[PDB]
Amino acid sequence: ANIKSAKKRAIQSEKARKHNASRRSMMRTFIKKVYAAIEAGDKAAAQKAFNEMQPIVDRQAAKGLIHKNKAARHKANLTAQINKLA
Amino acid sequence: MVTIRLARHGAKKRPFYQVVVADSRNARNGRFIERVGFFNPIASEKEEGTRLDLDRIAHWVGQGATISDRVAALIKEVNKA
Amino acid sequence: KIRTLQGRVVSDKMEKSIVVAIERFVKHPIYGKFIKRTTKLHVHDENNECGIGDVVEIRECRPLSKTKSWTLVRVVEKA
Amino acid sequence: ARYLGPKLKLSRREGTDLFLKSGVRAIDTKCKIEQAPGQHGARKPRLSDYGVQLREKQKVRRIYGVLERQFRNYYKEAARLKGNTGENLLALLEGRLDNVVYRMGFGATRAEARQLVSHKAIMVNGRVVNIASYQVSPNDVVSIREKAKKQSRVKAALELAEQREKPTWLEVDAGKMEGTFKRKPERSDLSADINEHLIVELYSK
RNA sequence: AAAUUGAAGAGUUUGAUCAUGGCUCAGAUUGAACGCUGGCGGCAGGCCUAACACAUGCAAGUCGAACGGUAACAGGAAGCAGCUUGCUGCUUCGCUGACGAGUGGCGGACGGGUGAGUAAUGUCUGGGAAACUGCCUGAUGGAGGGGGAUAACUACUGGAAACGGUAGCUAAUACCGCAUAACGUCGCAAGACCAAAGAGGGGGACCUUAGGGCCUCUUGCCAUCGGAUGUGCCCAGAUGGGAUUAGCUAGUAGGUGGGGUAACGGCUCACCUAGGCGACGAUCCCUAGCUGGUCUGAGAGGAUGACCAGCCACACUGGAACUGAGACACGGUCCAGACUCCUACGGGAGGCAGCAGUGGGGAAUAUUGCACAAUGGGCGCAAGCCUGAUGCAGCCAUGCCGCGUGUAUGAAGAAGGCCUUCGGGUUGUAAAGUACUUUCAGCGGGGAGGAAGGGAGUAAAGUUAAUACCUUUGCUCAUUGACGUUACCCGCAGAAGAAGCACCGGCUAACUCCGUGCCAGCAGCCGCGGUAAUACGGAGGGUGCAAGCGUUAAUCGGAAUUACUGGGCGUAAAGCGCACGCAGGCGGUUUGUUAAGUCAGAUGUGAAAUCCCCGGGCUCAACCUGGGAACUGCAUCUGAUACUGGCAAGCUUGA
Ligand SMILES: [Cu+]
Ligand SMILES: [K+]
Ligand SMILES: [K+]
Ligand SMILES: [K+]
Ligand SMILES: [K+]
Ligand SMILES: [K+]
Ligand SMILES: [K+]
Ligand SMILES: [K+]
Ligand SMILES: [K+]
Ligand SMILES: [K+]
Ligand SMILES: [K+]
Ligand SMILES: [K+]
Ligand SMILES: [K+]
Ligand SMILES: [K+]
Ligand SMILES: [K+]
Ligand SMILES: [K+]
Ligand SMILES: [K+]
Ligand SMILES: [K+]
Ligand SMILES: [K+]
Ligand SMILES: [K+]
Ligand SMILES: [K+]
Ligand SMILES: [K+]
Ligand SMILES: [K+]
Ligand SMILES: [K+]
Ligand SMILES: [K+]
Ligand SMILES: [K+]
Ligand SMILES: [K+]
Ligand SMILES: [Mg+2]
Ligand SMILES: [Mg+2]
Ligand SMILES: [Mg+2]
Ligand SMILES: [Mg+2]
Ligand SMILES: [Mg+2]
Ligand SMILES: [Mg+2]
Ligand SMILES: [Mg+2]
Ligand SMILES: [Mg+2]
Ligand SMILES: [Mg+2]
Ligand SMILES: [Mg+2]
Ligand SMILES: [Mg+2]
Ligand SMILES: [Mg+2]
Ligand SMILES: [Mg+2]
Ligand SMILES: [Mg+2]
Ligand SMILES: [Mg+2]
Ligand SMILES: [Mg+2]
Ligand SMILES: [Mg+2]
Ligand SMILES: [Mg+2]
Ligand SMILES: [Mg+2]
Ligand SMILES: [Mg+2]
Ligand SMILES: [Mg+2]
Ligand SMILES: [Mg+2]
Ligand SMILES: [Mg+2]
Ligand SMILES: [Mg+2]
Ligand SMILES: [Mg+2]
Ligand SMILES: [Mg+2]
Ligand SMILES: [Mg+2]
Ligand SMILES: [Mg+2]
Ligand SMILES: [Mg+2]
Ligand SMILES: [Mg+2]
Ligand SMILES: [Mg+2]
Ligand SMILES: [Mg+2]
Ligand SMILES: [Mg+2]
Ligand SMILES: [Mg+2]
Ligand SMILES: [Mg+2]
């Protein structure tokens, strides 16, 4: 980089990338827990995993890592799949 | 944001400003939303040196447009007839 | 009201889809003669009511597949 | 940008007096006006139709002291303006400031009036104008400058002016050396020896 | 009112003619180039080729009113001393004005460049639904209580450098929980779940340490619903050439389900159906940024897309994502490649299609300038800083427009030149001479406008506990111009400093002599040159333009010579050898109906600029500018029904 502000922006963006990546992995792990519970066919476990998942995606959407529409999509899809497990 | 400012037209050493509403990001003489007046700084006597559509300006200000300093001064001068 | 086209079904072999030919009558820009032009549209046909040769009635909607952005309103005439 | 050669050769080529001299003498006593200039000037010129059109246009140009680019612009303006194109062209030529000064009589010739205009000795509506091609509007006042009122050539031009016909579209006071351009001259008020339709046809070739 | 005032031919085939038919010329124009020549000014324009390679300088920062801090320098405070009797110099303290480096916010996605790619992925016109949107703006509510880090810094250390490594300390409007949770998210519902940040000015009782949470004000933070703007997406019509490219396509076409996106969608995956496009030209090949517009044309058309503005695409080449409201990012990141460079040989650095400039290519295209004074943009409460945007300046007759290079008189019709039938004629009022003026250039003096604002004071009003702060409105005081020796005005001097280029047989305005002798040469065509050349070359004279004039290139015109307007086919080029016939084009006559074509009106849109009309300002003009007209189109709505089309019923004259 040739401009001082560009250099600082690169440093800041790398730090932001690490932070974002850890949060994104965490959220994905919880969603995958819900999906695995649905796959196993255990409705109670699926509901428990969904309950643990919901605040995480909501908080991430509020923080701006994902969008509100994406959080809503996750919640709606998982609720629809869980309700059919009966 | 939306702003009300002057676009410089005319000739060399003889500027003539068009008072326009525009997205502030556009170039000074570029894309604009609506033309609302003009201002000639070298207008001769008995010649209209400033004209503004105050109704349109007020409409855009109510919609949330900002105003450049020169346009604000021109509005003040026009209102002080 | 709603803008709306009317045409003739030229294919119905797709599942819930039809091809509709719309005819326009326009003056030739140079020679002035009125000529016929055809536009073929992919139309969503739920219940698969339409058949080849029927005169059908279509409107514009959101995309439904790669080539489908129109949907069937009613069947004006049946072959 | 100005013809600076002998003046009577132009009138000899055009076969008529172009008023390029003051008029204190006779054109016949000053030159062989009936003879075209040059070694072969005694020959009888058979002129084609293009030649006739060209000679008429050149005659008008030499009368008013206008070069070709300006004259073509005058013709374009005359064609653009509503009405008869040839009459519009003549009116535009007569509206020139140097011509107006000459007709008012402050200059013995159009060249002298042009020099007076150029040297900042002429005022229009109370402002100094030194553009020979300035267009004079109706009700305008053309006056001699106070520092130029003492010039003897102005008095000579004034005493030569009344020896000719008085233009009826102007109102001149020689005591104060100032005139009013009452209105644009009509076609009738201009010379009948000018065939402007030839110029109009020439510019359509 | 006004805004469609518009249309020329000529030469050449023949012994001659009429026709046909090509070729050639006169016009206008240009980002032009070249040759000759060259005075001034105004406005504009200036790498069309190598999207070739680039030395050097500059083109993006800013905020201390978010934060820890103190590298400076400037004060304040303590001591000492040459002391020069309190002026100086050296140390200790961030205590203040401030501020290097650092954390954090915002900007860097704008502004600027280029046209490589792109033939519809784009662009233009008109519609549309399944979306997000920083800064700005409206409304309703919140802004409680905690925690763990980390740069800077300190110590040690690796490396030539670039760049790191280890340990320890610290702050926030950096980061993360907890609480709060409804016009928000999920859900039929019940229910479940999600946020935040402080800073600054002033102050009495200062409720407590001279500060603050004690009050007030300003500003900032969070949630939701709106506005505005911007962006993403879908559809129809239009937008080059080639058929000596006729078949193309397997995520291909559609469906269901899962995933994915801000959002619809084969966007992606699994399965099912076997579809989808194409002679109304698919696929393939060549060329190409598109538009408003520009040139030409009487128009219809034809050609074109430089400058200005809108849209798109690209940023050394290929690929990728990260951050972010927004980028798959010209002056950011990563990988690979080619070149250039540094190296201690381990390893590192770079991207002018930003402005200026260099080399190179080319027939050809400019200065390594001044200033942020104005307009606009970034950050900032502001002051202000940054801004090769922009405003200006330099170079170039590149274009357009204006002006000057003098005016009047002057026969001796002077000399000299050229021609001469030797009489004379022409150059020619031309010159000389005589009277005059002095634009422009030169010199000296005066002198607008582009300046709005901002800063200090004040008085009033609004706020509050407060004559405090803050805001607003007036008034007062000093100021802000790169251009710049500005435009412009006045004075001095003296015609004094200022004319060339092409052509002259016909088209085509303009004629003689001499030289040469099918030679030298000219030439757009017809042609010219053979010893009396108006055609070659010089001269005299003349013609046309004129600070320009010629030549070359290129487009339209003339060319009704691709003919829609507006042509032809017996013999000039041209009727398939003759038919049948699908698609296609066309359709006798009457009534009813429909209203698709057609017609009328209205509404929305058709950006601004450009063109045109009427005006205004630069002394005029070019140029700038107000309003209108126009944008001949598209869509929608409402009407008309003669004609064409659809539908229904007929009729008999075509069959
Ligand atoms: Cu090394
Ligand atoms: K910063
Ligand atoms: K679908
Ligand atoms: K006319
Ligand atoms: K011939
Ligand atoms: K011919
Ligand atoms: K022949
Ligand atoms: K014969
Ligand atoms: K940014
Ligand atoms: K291109
Ligand atoms: K908190
Ligand atoms: K406070
Ligand atoms: K507050
Ligand atoms: K696909
Ligand atoms: K699908
Ligand atoms: K799908
Ligand atoms: K045209
Ligand atoms: K065009
Ligand atoms: K590329
Ligand atoms: K940019
Ligand atoms: K500025
Ligand atoms: K003589
Ligand atoms: K004040
Ligand atoms: K001889
Ligand atoms: K025809
Ligand atoms: K209709
Ligand atoms: K009908
Ligand atoms: Mg790097
Ligand atoms: Mg000129
Ligand atoms: Mg012959
Ligand atoms: Mg280029
Ligand atoms: Mg700088
Ligand atoms: Mg600092
Ligand atoms: Mg935060
Ligand atoms: Mg919570
Ligand atoms: Mg084109
Ligand atoms: Mg789609
Ligand atoms: Mg290209
Ligand atoms: Mg024509
Ligand atoms: Mg372009
Ligand atoms: Mg390059
Ligand atoms: Mg992101
Ligand atoms: Mg891009
Ligand atoms: Mg960038
Ligand atoms: Mg660069
Ligand atoms: Mg450059
Ligand atoms: Mg070269
Ligand atoms: Mg001068
Ligand atoms: Mg002023
Ligand atoms: Mg002739
Ligand atoms: Mg001879
Ligand atoms: Mg010759
Ligand atoms: Mg033609
Ligand atoms: Mg013919
Ligand atoms: Mg024959
Ligand atoms: Mg024949
Ligand atoms: Mg036959
Ligand atoms: Mg037949
Ligand atoms: Mg019929
Ligand atoms: Mg327009
Ligand atoms: Mg109008
Ligand atoms: Mg009918």
The residues, any chain, with a CB within 8 Å of residue A13's CB and separated by 6 or more, are: none
Single-letter amino acid code for the residue at C49 = E
Q: Ligand 24 centroid to D89 CA: how many Å?
A: 54
In this structure, is residue D185 part of a structural domain? no
Resolution in A: 1.5
Say if residue D103 is in the same domain as residue D129. yes
How many angstroms is C1' of E68 away from CA of D45?
A: 105
Residue D145 near residue D121, CB atoms below 8 Å:
yes
Q: How far is Cα D78 from Cα D84, in angstroms, rounded to an integer?
A: 8
Contact C43, C18 (CB under 8 A): yes
Question: What torsion, rounded to 10 degrees, do the Cα atoms B10, B15, B18, B21 define?
Answer: 120
Tell me how far apart the alpha carbons of residues D190 and D94 are, in angstroms, rounded to a whole number.
9
Phi then psi for residue A39, to 5 deg, are -60, -40
Ion ligand 3 contact residues with beta carbon within 5 A: C 65
DSSP chain D: ----S-SHHHHHHHTS----S-SSS-HHHHS-TTS-SSTTTTS-----HHHHHHHHHHHHHHHHT--HHHHHHHHHHHHHSSS-HHHHHHHHHHTBHHHHHHHHTSSSSHHHHHHHHHTT-EEETTEE---TTPBPPTTEEEEE-GGGTT-HHHHHHHHHHTTSPPPTTEEEETTTTEEEE-SPPPSTTS-TT--HHHHHHHTT-
Say whether both D98 and D176 belong to one domain: yes
Whose tokens are 């110029």? That residue is: D199
Q: Cα–Cα distance between D201 and D51 in angstroms, integer?
A: 12
Give the number of domains in chain A: 1
Q: Which residues pair with D173 in a beta bridge?
A: D178
Q: Which residue has the tokens 């046809």?
A: D201
Which range marks the domain in which residue A51 is found?
A: 1-86
Q: Which DSSP category does C48 fall into? A: G
Contact between the CB of B6 and strand E at under 7 Å: yes
* D27 lies in the same domain as D104: no
- Return d(Cα C23, Cα D81) in angstroms, integer: 50
What is the spatial order of strands in the sheet that D127-128 belongs to?
Answer: D127-128, D122-124, D140-144, D178-181, D170-173
Give domain status of residue D125, yes or no.
yes
For residue B42, which ligand has an atom nearest its CA? 49
- Amino acid identity, residue D129? V
Distance D195 CA to E78 C1' (A): 109
Cα–Cα distance measured from residue C22 to residue C40, given in angstroms and rounded to the nearest whole number: 6
- What is residue C33's three-state secondary structure? coil
D2 in a structural domain? no
C-contacting chains (≥3 CB pairs under 8 Å): none
Per-residue CB contacts under 7 A with strand E, chain D residues 138-167? 147-148, 151-153, 156
Distance CA C70, CA D32 (A): 93
Give B14's contacts (C-beta < 8 A, 6+ positions apart). Answer: B42
How many domains, chain D?
2
Domain of B25 in residue numbering reads as: 1-81
Q: From the Cβ of C31, is strand E under 7 Å away? A: yes
Q: What is the domain extent for residue D62?
A: 7-93+190-204
Provide the 8-state DSSP code for C54.
-
| Strand E proximal to D58 Cβ, under 7 A | yes
- Neighbour tally for B44: CB within 10 Å: 7
Question: Do D43 and D18 share a structural domain?
Answer: yes
How far does chain C reach from its first CA to its final CA, in angstroms? Answer: 28
Instruction: Determine the distance separating the centroid of ligand 46 and the alpha carbon of A31, expressed in angstroms.
Output: 55
- Secondary structure, 3-state, B21-66: EEECCCCCCCCCCEEEEEECCCCCCCCCCEEECHHHHHHHHHHCCE
* Determination technique used: cryo-EM
**How long is the CA C1 to C1' E278 vector, in angstroms?**
36
| Nearest residue to D105 via CA among D64, D161, D29 | D161
Which residue, chain included where needed, has tokens 């952005």? C69
* Strand E positions within 7 A of protein Cβ atoms: 5-8, 26, 39, 42-44, 60-62, 102-108, 110-112, 127-132, 134-137, 175-178, 184-187, 192-196, 223-224, 227-230, 233-238, 253-256, 258-267, 272-278, 280, 301, 308-311, 322-325, 329, 331-333, 350-351, 374-378, 389-393, 401-411, 413, 418-419, 425-430, 435-439, 449-454, 474, 489-491, 499, 507-512, 540-547, 564, 584-586, 596-598, 607-608, 612-614, 616-621, 623-626, 635-637
Q: Say which residues have a Cβ less than 8 Å from residue D45's Cβ, sequence separation at least 6.
A: D36, D51
**Six-digit token string for C46:** 């739920």
Number of domains in chain B: 1
Within window 30-69 on B, which residues have Cβ closer than 7 Å to strand E? 30-31, 33, 35, 38, 41-42, 44, 46-47, 51, 62-66, 68-69
**What separation in angstroms does the CA of A51 have from each of A28, A45, A48, A83, D149?**
15, 10, 5, 14, 107
Answer whether B50's CB lies under 8 Å from B40's CB.
yes
Sequence ranges of the domains in chain C: 3-79
The answer as to whether D106 is a domain residue is yes
Asked whether strand E has any atom less than 7 Å from the CB of A28, the reply is no
Cβ of B15 near strand E (under 7 Å)? The reply is yes
